[PDB]
A paper describes a structure:
Recently, we described the drug-like compound PF846 and its derivatives that target proteins by inhibiting the translation of specific mRNAs by the human ribosome. These small molecules bind in the ribosome exit tunnel in a eukaryotic-specific pocket formed by highly conserved 28S ribosomal RNA (rRNA) residues. Surprisingly, PF846 can also block translation termination of specific polypeptides. Taken together, our data support a model in which PF846 inhibits translation termination by first slowing down translation elongation before reaching the stop codon and subsequently blocking NC hydrolysis from the P-site tRNA, thereby trapping the NC on the ribosome.
Interestingly, the major population of ribosomes in the cryo-EM data adopts an entirely different conformation, the nonrotated state, with an overall resolution of 2.8 Å sufficient to visualize chemical modifications of rRNA and tRNA nucleotides. In the resulting maps of this state, the small-molecule PF846 is also well resolved, along with the protein NC, P-site tRNA, and eRF1. The global conformation of the ribosome resembles that observed previously for eRF1-bound translation termination complexes, consistent with the structure representing a stalled termination complex. In the structure, the protein NC is well defined in the ribosome exit tunnel with an average resolution of 3–3.5 Å, allowing us to accurately model the NC conformation and sequence register. In striking contrast to the NC in PF846-stalled translation elongation complexes, the NC in the stalled termination complex adopts an α-helical geometry spanning 21 amino acids (residues 705–725), followed by the NPN motif (residues 726–728) in an extended conformation. Nascent-chain residues L718, L721, and I722 contact 28S rRNA nucleotides U4525, A4419, A3887, and G3883, and residues L714, I717, and L718 engage in multiple interactions with PF846 through van der Waals forces. In the present structure, eRF1 docks in the mRNA decoding site, positioning a highly conserved NIKS motif (Asn–Ile–Lys–Ser) located in the N-terminal domain to recognize the stop codon. In the present structure, we were able to model 4R-hydroxylysine at residue 63 in the cryo-EM density, with the hydroxyl group hydrogen bonding to the backbone carbonyl of asparagine 61 in the NIKS motif and the side-chain ε-amine hydrogen bonding to the O4 carbonyl in U1. The positioning of eRF1 in both the mRNA decoding site in the small ribosomal subunit and the PTC in the large ribosomal subunit indicates that eRF1 is bound in an active conformation. However, rearrangements in the PTC and ribosome exit tunnel could explain the slow hydrolysis of peptidyl-tRNA and trapping of the nascent chain by PF846.
Numbering used by the authors:
A (entry chain SC): 59 to 278
B (entry chain SR): 2 to 132
C (entry chain Sa): 2 to 100
D (entry chain SV): 1 to 83
E (entry chain SX): 2 to 71
F (entry chain SA): 2 to 217
G (entry chain SW): 2 to 130
The structure:
RNA sequence: CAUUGGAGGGCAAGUCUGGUGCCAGCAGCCGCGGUAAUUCCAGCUCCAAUAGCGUAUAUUAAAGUUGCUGCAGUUAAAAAGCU
RNA sequence: ACGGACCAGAGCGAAAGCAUUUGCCAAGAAUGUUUUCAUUAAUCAAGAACGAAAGUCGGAGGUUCGAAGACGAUCAGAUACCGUCGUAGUUCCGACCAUAAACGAUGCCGACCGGCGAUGCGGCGGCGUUAUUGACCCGCCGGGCAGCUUCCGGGAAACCAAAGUCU
RNA sequence: UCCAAACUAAUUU
């Protein structure tokens, strides 16, 4: 019973966009959860990272709402992270899955050395930065595993990063800035320009452009 | 303390847009109209809605009202909108320019263009406000 | 924390400015810190100007002025309501109040 | 980009800003990709062809995307040389 | 900042050796004053003689009587 | 645009630009608008180079013809000197006009009523229309702007150096733009003038209206 | 004062890179900089650079391709043996796949992959990636 | 005939039952106990590592809390009054 | 004794600090320069000069003000606030003393990195006004004190064009 | 610009 309300949501439902790669090429702002449910559905696994209570002092006692940290992502290079504060536990956990789905980013995997098989670790030394926390991701060799704190390990496993050495800094006792600084790190593995990507970009035309005809008789 | 709430002001504006042809400047006439075209639950509300329509009828009669589209007024400010005089305002055939305006036209390669009578530039350089 | 970018005074390229005394309570205030108020209040109080001018021995006699430059400390200028407290973004505003 | 066998092991190759040669990221939502129409050399009507330029958002937040597209179109000769 | 030059090892080694004294765990393990002050004398255990049974009151909010020996 | 003699300026159009006063700029100058300026006068007024503003205006026209659905181009003027020209622009070219107050979230708040997702923005003034320029940086949306000497060119992607302050010079630059859209599409021809008479687009003052109703 | 000319050269190239500029002035030209830029240019991170002679320590205009992430110098020029070179590799370079440590060996100013081939150590100048 | 420690949280494992009622006690740390104790004393269960396992003390990592790699020094500890 | 108004987010000084007129003495920055020398430099344990106020020791002087002191009030008390007197001190000359929220709570030298409008000094250029080389006007260059503005970047943030160029 | 000081050891959210 999902009716899309966006121009991008119409082309997804009408079987015109075949993967998220056609969206991530053009940096199109995802504003609907079902677009992620359409492609990556029945492959995503969720996990609640922490339910922390926050309090607002009022003139009649305290106004406690509940804040929810939800990790999402299939184990093959996509990770979201959603934060939502609500008055109820189940209300917060539901809505923070949506915000986690609207932040699915691709994770570029790379090789430590001797590029044999499938890419298994981070391509180079990246570093996230959130709050006082900076989380560095160092490329490990093959059977190393993820040598890290238990909070970003749940984020790095859900990217299909098999191998990483992790350095941390700052107050990692707050989980919010320590989950985001991890999420800021793996979301710039594509933002970094290696020598592999110096070949000039051929320009494919935009999905709002290569369906102007299918779009105008249906979405209008 | 006679301030009218939003449920009276919102209902009165939708009546006039739908039924401007029936309304006048009599309260008691529009009192009978407002019960004819509307399911108003109470009589004391009915006098307030009719009392604010008749107040608006004077403002509509003098000029336009912010939020109310009158088809007599909307379609006849279109003559203000769709207006073209018999001569354009641009075809002047003698255009007062500066020597710097003329000297750019030479670098624009239109120095052989017609007159565009130059004016003497002001010798003051008094163009800034005192601070 | 720091509340104003200058420190409530106009001392930038020097080390020490000479002090003056508050005209309301004689507190030593640096000269750039003090709330300066130049008043050109008339000496006549225009409720009384139509009595002084009808009683003059002249006909066209412009009444004189009174030129007092007042100084204030921050304590007295607030208490006299010469100045007021402002919002955090409204402190960053140096245009004087209009006339 | 590829393992030593030659298989392209990637999800996608990202675009590069055609004025700064840096990666247009996944969530760089200020990054545009505009098209400049091509006209024929005789009548000046739209023939169906176009040039594609992409400007990343940081160059766009800098306020230099104006001169950037202006320089990228003087290389194709779309803008006149005597600008 | 810090000196980085290639012959500054003495400046770096001596500044370090002076600034080691400004934390607690180095200071008490190298003065010998605290080693002089604990009654074990650098040992883990000691045998003694009970002189007296003493009652020690607990610090608040706790409100018990802690049974100790002198 | 392109050193094609069919796309050149055709001096008929120069007398329009001098009669409206499009070559006149402000007394102060933005550093990024420096390349479009010819020379400052004696009264502080900068002179806009008309060769520069002809190339960008034709560059701006190529960006609109590259849009397939004509209503994907959205045109905004919040300042009243230009609200008439925007409506009559989209009446010809088929664009999507937003006259008056631009409500925020029009491009970002996907649940409300007026939520349209364009592919191109054309505005009148970067300082006055800063709000949709700011929101166009959230949705990958390139913007064309009419710009003066003192305009901040932040999210402007094609700037047309003009006089967007006078009423006669706002409407002319919208008129010259609409004419070059329909010529490049081939809808109207360029062997004969166009039947619109460019003072159709000019903003007329409310006291200027009623003073000629007895004259006309 | 200015103690190190190579450091002020590489800091100015690094600042103009992230500002997105195309060209950059490098004030005083030494021959160590020129030999440093060619190693950056043979591996293709910078364009052609023009050297300007003004009858003192000249100036260099450098074309920037937009490929450089970080050109850094190492102070002091620590002597590096071939035994210790791989420990500098995983402290300076972001990956084992790209990036170079520039050495000055007796056979000239070299990147670190060439010095393994030639089997020689040297003092470290800087790095770029 | 398998012990040694635990079961509020850190931290794997019970809102079980009985006693005690800021007492006796526990508790490295935050804490628990003043009459319905998820923490005491016991029974039942359960957990952990196992012929081993607690506890005290020196010490190393954790500690980018001594910082060569690698710390800070506007307001958190801190740039000498100035040359 | 003190130098008001003029007197400023203006100047000068290493900082402390510096304001009536005129004369004398020595200093100095910045600018100008197709002069000269040719690395003479940068930062600095030890050492050295300077260092408000209060205080100390000698002389001189003491108008104002005023610790201490004495009263008058207020007060439950009031050896405080407020008032009335008033020592040392405040003033100068010659020695000491070496500390201040001695603060931009921000070492110094150097490089690079956004705009914009002003300001002070020096130089240069430019329509015209005005006086018998100055005064205004429009810019340019360099050092300076600052401001506004910015998603440069940074930061725990407040905020900083430096506290930026730092995993 | 008159005065205006103090606040269970008796605990359980
Ligand atoms: Mg001082
Ligand atoms: Mg436990
Ligand atoms: Mg240790
Ligand atoms: Mg370590
Ligand atoms: Mg520390
Ligand atoms: Mg402190
Ligand atoms: Mg200091
Ligand atoms: Mg005077
Ligand atoms: Mg010393
Ligand atoms: Mg003294
Ligand atoms: Mg004496
Ligand atoms: Mg008294
Ligand atoms: Mg004294
Ligand atoms: Mg001190
Ligand atoms: Mg700092
Ligand atoms: Zn006072």
């Amino acid at each position: 019973e999902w009716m899309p309300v966006t121009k991008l949501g119409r082309l997804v439902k009408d079987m015109k966009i075949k993967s998220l790669e056609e969206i991530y090429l053009f940096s199109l702002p995802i504003k609907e959860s079902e677009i992620i449910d359409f492609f990556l559905g029945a492959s995503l696994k969720d996990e609640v990272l922490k339910i922390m209570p926050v309090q607002k002092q009022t003139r009649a006692g305290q106004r406690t709402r509940f804040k929810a940290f939800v990790a999402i992502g299939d184990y093959n290079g996509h990770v979201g992270l959603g934060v939502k504060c609500s008055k109820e536990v189940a209300t917060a956990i539901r809505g923070a899955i949506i915000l986690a789905k609207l932040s699915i980013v691709p994770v570029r995997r790379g090789y430590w050395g001797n590029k044999i098989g499938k890419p298994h670790t981070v391509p180079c030394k990246v570093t996230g930065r959130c709050g006082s926390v900076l989380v560095r991701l160092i490329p490990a060799p093959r059977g190393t595993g993820i040598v890290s704190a238990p909070v970003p390990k749940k984020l790095l496993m859900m990217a299909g990063i098999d191998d990483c050495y992790t350095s941390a800094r700052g107050c990692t006792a707050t989980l919010g800035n320590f989950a985001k600084a991890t999420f800021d790190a793996i979301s710039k593995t594509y933002s970094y320009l290696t020598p592999d990507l110096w070949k000039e970009t051929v320009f494919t035309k935009s999905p709002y452009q290569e369906f102007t005809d299918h779009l105008v008789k249906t979405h209008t | 303390g006679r301030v009218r709430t939003k449920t009276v002001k919102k209902a009165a504006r939708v009546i006039i847009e739908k039924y401007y042809t029936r309304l006048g400047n009599d309260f008691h006439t529009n009192k009978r109209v407002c019960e004819e075209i509307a399911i108003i639950p109470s009589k004391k509300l009915r006098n307030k809605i009719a009392g604010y329509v008749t107040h608006l009828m004077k403002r509509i009669q003098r000029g336009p009202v912010r939020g109310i589209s009158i088809k007599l007024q909307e379609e006849e400010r279109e003559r203000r909108d769709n207006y073209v005089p018999e001569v354009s305002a641009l075809d002047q055939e003698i255009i007062e320019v500066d020597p710097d305006t003329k000297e750019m036209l030479k670098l624009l390669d239109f120095g052989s263009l017609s007159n565009l009578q130059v004016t003497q530039p002001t010798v003051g350089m008094n163009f800034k406000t005192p601070r | 924390t720091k509340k104003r970018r200058n420190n409530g005074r106009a001392k930038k390229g020097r080390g020490h400015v000479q002090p003056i005394r508050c005209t309301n309570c004689a507190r030593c205030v640096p000269k750039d810190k003090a709330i300066k108020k130049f008043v050109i209040r008339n000496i006549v109080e225009a409720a009384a100007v139509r009595d002084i001018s009808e009683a003059s021995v002249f006909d066209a006699y412009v009444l004189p002025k009174l030129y007092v430059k007042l100084h204030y400390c921050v304590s007295c200028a607030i208490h006299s309501k010469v100045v007021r407290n402002r919002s955090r973004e409204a402190r960053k505003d140096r245009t004087p109040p209009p006339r | 980009m590829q393992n030593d066998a030659g298989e392209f092991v990637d999800l996608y190759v990202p675009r590069k800003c055609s004025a700064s040669n840096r990666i247009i990221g996944a969530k760089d939502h200020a990054s545009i990709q505009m098209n400049v129409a091509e006209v024929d050399k005789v009548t000046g009507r739209f023939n169906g062809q176009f040039k594609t330029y992409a400007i990343c958002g940081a160059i766009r937040r800098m306020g230099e995307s104006d001169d950037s597209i202006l320089r990228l179109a003087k290389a194709d000769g779309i803008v006149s040389k005597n600008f | 900042g810090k000196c980085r030059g290639l012959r500054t090892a003495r400046k770096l080694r001596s500044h370090r050796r002076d600034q080691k004294w400004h934390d607690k765990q180095y200071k008490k393990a190298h003065l010998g004053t605290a080693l002089k002050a604990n009654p074990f004398g650098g040992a883990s255990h000691a045998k003694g003689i009970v002189l007296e049974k003493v009652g020690v009151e607990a610090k608040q909010p706790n409100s018990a009587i802690r049974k100790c020996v002198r | 645009s392109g050193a094609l003699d069919v796309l050149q300026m055709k001096e008929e159009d120069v007398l329009k630009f001098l009669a409206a006063g499009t070559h006149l700029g402000g007394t102060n100058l933005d550093f990024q608008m420096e390349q479009y300026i010819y020379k400052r006068k004696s009264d502080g007024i900068y002179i806009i180079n008309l060769k520069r503003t002809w190339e960008k205006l034709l560059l701006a026209a190529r960006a609109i013809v590259a849009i397939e659905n004509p209503a994907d181009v959205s045109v905004i003027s919040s300042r009243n000197t230009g609200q008439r020209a925007v409506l009559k622009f989209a009446a010809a070219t088929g664009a999507t006009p937003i006259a008056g107050r631009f409500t925020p979230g029009t491009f970002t708040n996907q649940i409300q009523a007026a939520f349209r997702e364009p592919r191109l923005l054309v505005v009148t003034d970067p300082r006055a229309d800063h709000q949709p320029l700011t929101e166009a940086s959230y949705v990958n949306l390139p913007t064309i702007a009419l710009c003066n000497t003192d305009s901040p060119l932040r999210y402007v992607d094609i700037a047309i150096p003009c006089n967007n302050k006078g009423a006669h010079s706002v409407g002319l630059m919208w008129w010259m733009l609409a004419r070059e859209v329909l010529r490049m599409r081939g809808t109207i021809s360029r062997e004969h003038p166009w039947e619109v008479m460019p003072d159709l687009y000019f903003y007329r003052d409310p006291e200027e209206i009623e003073k000629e109703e007895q004259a006309a | 004062v200015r103690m190190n000319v190579l450091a002020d050269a590489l800091k100015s190239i690094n600042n103009a890179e992230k500002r997105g500029k195309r060209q950059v002035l490098i004030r005083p030209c030494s021959k160590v900089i020129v030999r440093f830029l060619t190693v950056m240019m043979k591996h293709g991170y910078i364009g052609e650079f023009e050297i300007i002679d003004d009858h003192r320590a000249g100036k260099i205009v450098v074309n920037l391709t937009g490929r450089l992430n970080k050109c850094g110098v190492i102070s002091p020029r620590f002597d590096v043996q071939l035994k210790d070179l791989e420990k500098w590799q995983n402290n300076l370079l972001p990956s084992r796949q790209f990036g170079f440590i520039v050495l000055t060996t007796s056979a000239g100013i070299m990147d670190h992959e060439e010095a393994r081939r030639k089997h020689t150590g040297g003092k470290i100048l800087g790095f770029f990636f």
